[PDB]
Design a binder for this molecule. Structure first.
Ligand SMILES: [Zn+2]
Ligand SMILES: [Zn+2]
Lengths: 51, 87, 112, 104, 245
RNA sequence: CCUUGUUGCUGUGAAGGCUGGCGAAAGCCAGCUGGAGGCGGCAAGCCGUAUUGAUCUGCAAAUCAUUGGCGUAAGCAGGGUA
RNA sequence: GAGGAGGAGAAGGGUUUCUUCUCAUAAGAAGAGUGAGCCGGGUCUAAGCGAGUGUGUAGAAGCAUGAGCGAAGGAGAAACAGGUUGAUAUUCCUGUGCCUGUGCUGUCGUACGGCAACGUGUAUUAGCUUGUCGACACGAACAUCUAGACAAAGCAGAAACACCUUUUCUGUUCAAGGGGAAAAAGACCACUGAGACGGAUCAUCUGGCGACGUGGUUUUAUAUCUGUGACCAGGCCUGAGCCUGGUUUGUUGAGGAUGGUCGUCCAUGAAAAGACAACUAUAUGGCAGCACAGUCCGUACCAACCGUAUCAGGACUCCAAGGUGAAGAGCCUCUAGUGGAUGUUUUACACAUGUAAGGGAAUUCGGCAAAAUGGAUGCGUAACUUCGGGAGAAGUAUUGGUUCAAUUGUGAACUCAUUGUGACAAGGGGAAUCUGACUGUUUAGUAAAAACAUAGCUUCAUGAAGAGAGAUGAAGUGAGUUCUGCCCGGU
RNA sequence: CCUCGUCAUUUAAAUGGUGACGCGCAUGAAUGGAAUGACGAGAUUCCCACUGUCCCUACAUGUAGACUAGCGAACCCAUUU
């Protein structure tokens, strides 16, 4: 909801910046072997436990 | 007033609780609700605030007393004994 | 006394010692300001309300921002409002004591 | 008939949350807040409310003029006219008995 | 089995709370005082009313609590200690009060503040003064006779609020309000209606105790239920009391 | 245990009061006023008697329909605490 | 269908919100978006928790005292209208304000009046002490105010017209701050001097400790005015600006606010921070202008929450129109909001429902299920009873529309093709026996009961208390009425 | 227990109900005994009203079901029946 503590807000801000795919240029690099970022999440499928 | 032959103030309870118990309660219930005479101002304006404490609605004096009456039987007697000790 | 401090608004706690050598200039005007923001959202504010918008260091407060602007850019300030955004950036909005000067400072500084 | 929302705070209908309905120049019916009522001083002897003094809440009372908070007599607010008449007489009459008991 | 109801209710979190209390009840310590009765008040757990008193100790005003005797009023002046008059509601050394008199709030030893008679409607009777030993015999409301030294203090009158047990509580809710502040279990479930894991009287295909209900004084605590160390039982007449002053 | 929230419509008509009549008295009889009660019929709600109804690869690891019980109170509920 | 499938907050979720593009779609990718001295947190204290210290333990636990902590719905200085974005707004912009402090310049101050009830005067710090405010249960009736809703007249625009109609619909606005009545309800002051008697309430009641009367003093709302104009409706033109209105009266009325009364209780219904008055000393103090200051954290959106989900379940609160009717009941409408596995007339057996000749429980363990009765008004009401009740006992009759009398009691006439609480809503009743006195509670998910509880009755132990025999604990029986015989051999 | 005890009443007909009787396998007094009122979604018998419960079934409505487009599982299984 609208009321939040400072500690809860920083957790949300960090959880929101980490939630991104692999940038499209990295895929062209000779040494790079990852397909998809397995740390990506959806609000419909997991809980953060920020509480 | 007095629209009932026997039941008096206990008519509030209908047919519940025993007959014999209601007629014991009745004595106390009639005594609690009356106004009584003030010792300080003479008027009949004394009523009960809470068990043991009685109070005058004109002059504001508060006095210790019984649970259902302002002066109890033991007090009416003992008060006299003290007056004799002062002689 | 020890407590978990989960309801607190300031995340720092400890009082700080002296040191044998101290850092040259300290928290100072050129650490406080980061950049002015110039886009269609900001442009209206310069044109209508005589206010600039800036990104500022997380450690900064209203009094410090007021001083730093008057030192770097030179116009006098009426008000400062502050906003911690969802992207982790502290924004400051500064209204100048005379309007019109906002378009002068913005253009000199290359914000606009 | 237009219906209202709570603009600020909580919906939970406690003593600190009284509201009234008001019509604005723009022809809207809106809720607006209400401050609590104040009780003024009662006499220290008899419990009667003192004459000549205003009733307000502590913060608002302190901002009024001094004349709103007293009467010009031996006890200002504090006690009523009958209780001071009794006090003045009692102190006099007691001193006279002591005078007599000293002289006799 | 498990621990019985009687033990659980004696643990510390079940002790009566004091948050609504007015203060500790008892006499002042000084040799002589003149006091004024400030207010007469009800205290949440107690049926007898209390009186707040005001007295000077050095220059400073100080406040105390007495149990109210019947016939005081707010504003009354009262006299405490040696050289007080025999007037209703004064406090005096016991040796000054004549035989056959009725007293309340009696000190068991000097300066203890008053114990003994403190419940509504109660009093004690002065039955003997011994001029050699300086002892006095008082008859307590249980019928017990006890000896106290002549230097102990006592309040002259009967405790206010008498007659309260005349009116029956006809309903369950009336009993609820009376026991809400006491330590006894209400409502009280009978032991014969429990299972044998919960109570020594539990179990069986008919509701019965099955073993005698009179138990020893030295029995173990988690089974000491029933009539503890009874000398006799049943509704028959007893025997003559033996009496000495 | 501490701090709070939540009673709308109706029936019956106790205690106390005023008039009129009857009586030597004590105190009896009418009409009106008043509004008590873990008191009656219902609403919002809280519950769970029957159909041994529907469902039993369910809408659901206990639900749905009609029918029922209480509803001015040893009633129902949020947060803090043991 | 206003106890909404409407409009908003809390707990919980965390970008789900806005723009663009692509299908990959309850799918992705890239950007953008949350602004405060006056709203809430940071303060105070409840029940309570506790570092350290003392005592104890192999170390712990525990016990005594006690810094600090403990409520986003208890206490708690000061703000409101109107505008603006794709997305924020009592936070931004315009206007008018307020609280707490700081500094400059002017301008005044060092006291009086009334028999009194008390008034005039915007007034400094500091301290004892005494008191007040903060600061408080439930229930009932009666006043007064404000939202709201009606009805007439005026104007402006709409709807409808094979016929009829001045028929019908929508509008007619005024914030915080400043100034301010009459009224009603209570206190009190001066004169006066009252009874087998006057005054007064819906109800209690009230007076020589001073009635009625005649003149005053004071406390508590609201209407009205200002708030410098905003905002709305309509017309004319238009890639813009002008012009015209926003006027009068009556009835009712809270599910909000306030006031003084009355009732109930073996139940009498928080603290503290922070304030104020009197008394004592001490005095460069009041007001007007102008200027300066007020840090830190929260602020988007939810039909998106918990149940493995896009789940008929669960989940704390606020606002609330017209008709019918006792009634935020059911039924019907205005404001605001809403919807998809496709076609086919589709047997039998189902599941939700209707109707039935003659008979009327013959059915079945058993009237299980269904039918019948139903609101209001009147007449008339038994055994038994703790005299309160039984009791809506039972049993019977009436009820629509129209046009009149009469004013709350109701009467009378005329009229209709099955009759009238016409739909919706809405008791079946009696005679007996076993059992528990009554309202209440229980096996969340096969048992709601005769089981548990309960008031009352009886027994037992104690003079120890932060409690003191009308007390504090332990057992048994189960309201009331009427009784409760005999046995101490065994344990 | 014997037991569907005997006598009366209720029915056309009573292993039922109510009223009487009592050497009671094995009733009984706060392990509480006995007679009533008011109140039970408590157990039991009878009467009036009422009816598709029944004699003895018939007709009609909505929704599924049959056939058709799009979408698309599970229990179970030595199997030649
Ligand atoms: Zn008096
Ligand atoms: Zn006074």
């Amino acid at each position: 909801g609208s009321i939040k503590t400072r500690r809860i807000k920083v957790q949300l801000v960090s959880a929101l910046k980490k939630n991104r795919c692999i940038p499209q240029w990295k895929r062209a690099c000779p040494g790079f072997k990852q397909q998809y970022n397995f740390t990506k999440r959806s609000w419909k499928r997991k809980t953060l436990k920020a509480c | 007033s007095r629209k009932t032959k026997k039941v008096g103030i206990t008519g509030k309870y209908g047919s519940r609780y025993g007959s014999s118990l209601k007629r014991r309660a009745m004595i106390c219930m009639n005594a609690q609700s009356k106004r009584y005479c003030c010792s300080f101002c003479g008027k009949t304006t004394v009523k009960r605030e809470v068990i043991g404490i009685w109070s005058c609605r004109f002059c504001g004096k508060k006095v210790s007393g019984g649970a259902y009456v302002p002066i109890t039987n033991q007090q009416v007697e003992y008060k006299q004994v003290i007056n004799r000790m002062k002689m | 006394p020890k407590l978990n401090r989960h309801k607190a608004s300031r995340l720092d706690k400890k009082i700080k010692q002296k040191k044998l050598i101290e850092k040259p200039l300290g928290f100072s005007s050129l650490d406080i300001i980061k950049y002015g923001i110039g886009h269609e959202g900001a442009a209206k504010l310069i044109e209508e309300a005589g206010t600039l918008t800036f990104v500022v260091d997380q450690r900064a407060d209203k009094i410090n921002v007021k001083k730093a602007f008057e030192e770097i850019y030179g116009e006098k300030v009426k008000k400062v409002n502050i906003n911690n955004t969802m992207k982790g950036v502290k924004k400051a909005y500064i209204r100048l004591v005379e309007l019109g000067n906002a378009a002068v400072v913005a253009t000199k500084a290359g914000i606009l | 008939v237009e219906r209202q929302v709570v603009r600020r705070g909580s919906t939970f209908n406690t003593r600190s949350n009284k509201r009234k309905k008001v019509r604005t120049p723009g022809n809207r019916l809106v809720f607006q807040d209400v401050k609590k009522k104040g009780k003024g001083p009662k006499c220290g002897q008899c419990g009667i409310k003192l004459a000549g003094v205003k009733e307000a809440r502590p913060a608002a009372f302190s901002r009024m003029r001094k004349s709103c908070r007293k009467v010009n007599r031996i006890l200002g607010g504090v006690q009523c006219a009958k209780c001071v008449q009794e006090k003045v007489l009692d102190a006099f009459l007691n001193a006279e008995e002591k005078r007599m008991k000293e002289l006799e | 089995g498990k621990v019985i109801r009687t033990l659980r209710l004696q643990k510390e979190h079940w002790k009566r709370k004091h948050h609504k209390s007015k203060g500790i009840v008892g006499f002042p310590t000084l040799k002589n005082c003149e006091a004024t009765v400030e207010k007469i008040v009800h205290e949440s757990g107690r049926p007898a009313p209390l009186a707040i008193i005001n007295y000077k100790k050095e220059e400073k005003n100080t406040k105390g609590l007495l149990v109210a005797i019947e016939g005081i009023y707010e504003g009354q002046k009262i006299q405490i200690g040696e050289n007080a008059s025999l007037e209703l509601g004064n406090v005096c050394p016991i040796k000054e009060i004549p035989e056959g008199s009725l007293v309340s709030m009696v000190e068991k030893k000097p300066k203890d503040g008053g114990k003994y008679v403190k419940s509504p409607g109660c009093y004690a009777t002065i039955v003997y003064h011994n001029k050699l030993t300086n002892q006095t015999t008082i008859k307590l409301p249980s019928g017990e006779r006890v000896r106290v030294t002549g230097e102990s203090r006592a309040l002259l009158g009967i405790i206010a609020g008498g007659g309260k047990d005349d009116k029956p509580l006809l309903k369950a809710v009336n009993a609820y309000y009376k026991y809400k502040t006491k330590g006894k279990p209400w409502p009280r479930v009978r032991g014969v209606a429990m299972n044998p894991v919960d109570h020594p009287h539990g179990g069986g295909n008919h509701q019965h105790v099955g073993h005698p209900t009179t138990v020893s004084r030295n029995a173990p605590v988690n089974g000491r239920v029933g009539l503890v160390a009874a000398r006799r039982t049943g509704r028959k007449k007893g025997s003559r009391k033996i009496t000495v002053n």
